[PDB]
């Protein structure tokens, strides 16, 4: 199991005078931070969200983001004027993964109107191949900012893996927690004329990895349709698995659920 840290920024520029920037951080599947345009601070969502950082460290990290947010939206408005761009959706996805064998990696990807345009590579900003020409002009300006460049490297190479190591420790018990799902069957819409839709709902499990198949005893029905894994408000997950059978094929059929919290005691519901 892996717990990368992904820091996500959503900056929306409706025109030259109206803009919002909002952020959040994820460790693995769990949201640890929330960063609101209304707020003067990034909010720790968990008792362990601060990692092993000192209060004085967190505060200057708060300061860094606070000035980052201000001049980022300053700078975006400049480039939009400079490069004659029409009104704007920017997204940032930055963070890192800790691998105890030195194979530790990090990333800082920026997207414009939903498309990758540039990322941080080694030491400087680098455009992607498919990005428009004009992005080249902006990277010429960005790479003249040696302090922003030195700081981004410190955050990626230094602050981030330090932070992830502290979060893995101070949040150890919640990360390893197991919550058992419940399941229930229901009749879905008639898919055809002589057909009935068997529906197996599975809700309440954590963490995310799960296995749900319709079965006739031990014969896994290849017709099993697994839904998306959808989130509940309490950080568990929900899953719908559907089967299209003929009028009389329903009887004798069972939904099987295997999850890391059950300890081999699968859930099995017979139709």
């Amino acid at each position, epitope marked *: 199991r892996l717990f990368p840290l992904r820091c996500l920024q959503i900056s929306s520029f409706a025109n030259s005078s109206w803009t919002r920037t909002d952020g959040l951080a994820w460790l693995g599947e769990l949201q640890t931070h929330s960063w609101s345009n209304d707020s003067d601070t990034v909010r720790s969502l968990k008792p362990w969200s601060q990692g092993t950082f000192s209060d*004085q460290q967190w505060e*200057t990290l708060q300061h860094i983001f606070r000035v980052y947010r201000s001049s980022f939206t300053r700078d975006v408005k400049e480039f939009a004027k400079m490069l004659r761009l029409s009104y704007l959706e920017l997204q940032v996805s930055a963070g890192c993964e800790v691998h105890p064998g030195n194979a530790s990696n990090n990333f800082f990807h920026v997207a414009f109107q939903g498309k990758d345009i540039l990322s941080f590579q080694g030491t400087s900003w680098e455009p992607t191949q498919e990005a428009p020409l004009w992005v080249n002009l902006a990277i010429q300006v960005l790479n003249q900012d040696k302090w922003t460049r030195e700081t981004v490297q410190w955050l990626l190479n*230094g602050t981030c893996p*330090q932070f992830v190591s502290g979060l893995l420790e101070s949040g150890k018990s919640e990360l390893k927690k197991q919550v058992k799902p419940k399941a229930w069957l229901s009749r879905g819409p008639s898919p055809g004329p002589g057909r009935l839709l068997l529906v197996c709902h599975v809700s309440g499990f954590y963490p995310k990895p799960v296995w749900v198949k319709w079965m006739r005893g031990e014969q896994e029905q290849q017709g099993t349709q697994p839904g998306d894994i959808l989130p509940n408000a309490d950080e568990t997950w929900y899953l719908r698995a559907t089967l299209d059978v003929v009028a009389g094929e329903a009887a004798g059929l069972s939904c099987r659920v295997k999850h890391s919290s059950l300890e081999g005691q699968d859930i099995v519901l017979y139709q």
Partner: T-cell receptor
Amino acid sequence: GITQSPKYLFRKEGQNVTLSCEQNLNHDAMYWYRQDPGQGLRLIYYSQIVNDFQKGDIAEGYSVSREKKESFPLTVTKNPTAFYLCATSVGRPYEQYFGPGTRLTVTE
Amino acid sequence: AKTTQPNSMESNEEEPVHLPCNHSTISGTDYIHWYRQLPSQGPEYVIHGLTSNVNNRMASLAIAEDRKSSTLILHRATLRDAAVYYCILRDGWGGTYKYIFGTGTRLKVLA
């Protein structure tokens, strides 16, 4: 960058003296170090920013002032003779820059 | 967190020199700085790194894999490189401005 006039400074015991440090570049933090022959640098006084200054491990006997951001004067008033080095600091990655140093000898 | 260096070191001219430094309690956000003080002069910045090896024109910094030790490497020492070399940690957060130096390594370069 950093100026320390003059290179050499001589004074008789029990007389007070103030060595100058003038920097032209725009650095907030300033430092005074003291070095004895064949010895390492020992920090006297540092000023993270104007009107502020904190005492290093051997400020006993020394006084300092930070009224402008381009100037940081050290004043001596037990073993005053030594090599006195002034430094400035930039932001991350926080490299230090040093004056050419002033030589101070105090005679009985 | 402090650093440790041998007191003195000798090396022949026109050979590379590996100057060692130990910093076992270093943290992920600590930079490693190296300074050089020629006789009668003020220290001079030489190089700094965080997590990757660094190459300037005359000197490189090799950082161990656990970041617990490091090496300043003069690519080719000449007589003029006789100096005291200081290996320092600099907190990347920028909290304490109590910037202090150890004793460093006095390098002698032999003809």
